[PDB]
């Protein structure tokens, strides 16, 4: 996250870190057994780390649980990033408590102008590289479809939205991928892509979670 703030330990209790020897992506706990992330975060050998604040120090509220199954969306295209969503099932159920909690799925799509919270352990510089150990947060609005399209001609599908600031300075970044965009208490986006980070006229692009709720629920119901 570029231009954000330190969230505070365990104040984003649905935020998980995906670890394969090191943190490589975020995700969102949606029930005791299942995490939402980006399909471009897929790999084998994932350990899900719940209850994290400093990802390099054991602080006392973590739960580490290995994935049993990853399901990439049926229509994910890794060239266009259309349908950039996957589900990860945990080998054992998480202990839910005030610091490890699931985030509700939307019941309708959110509108442009709605405020959201974007969070992760990604790069904090727009030029340059610096990775934080504690979780960072950014409050940012969803941008209109028309400004998103004009920012990225030929690249925004109906399964994507933009959020952030056309002026630049405040955005998600490499290492935030797969993490949450929560708006009015619902998971509306997944950190997906952009062109650099926090550049003028290049806002972040996010998977549009409201399009996937019936695939998410039916997948969970049979897996
Ligand atoms: N918002 C931009 C963005 C999101 S994930 C990611 C990975 C690499 C880079 Br560079 C930018 C990004
Ligand atoms: Ca920790
Ligand atoms: Cl792309």
UniProtKB/Swiss-Prot annotation:
This is Serine protease 1. One of its GO terms (molecular function) is endopeptidase activity. Its EC number is 3.4.21.4. It comes from the Eukaryota. Gene3D superfamilies: Trypsin-like serine proteases (2.40.10.10). It is found in: Secreted, Extracellular space. The lineage of its organism: Eukaryota, Metazoa, Chordata, Craniata, Vertebrata. One of its GO terms (biological process) is proteolysis. Synthesized in the acinar cells of the pancreas. Belongs to the peptidase S1 family. Substrate binds at residues 171-172, 174-175, 177. Transmembrane segments: none annotated. The active site is at 40 (charge relay system), 84 (charge relay system), 177 (charge relay system). Interacts with SERPINA1. The gene is PRSS1. It comes from Bos taurus.
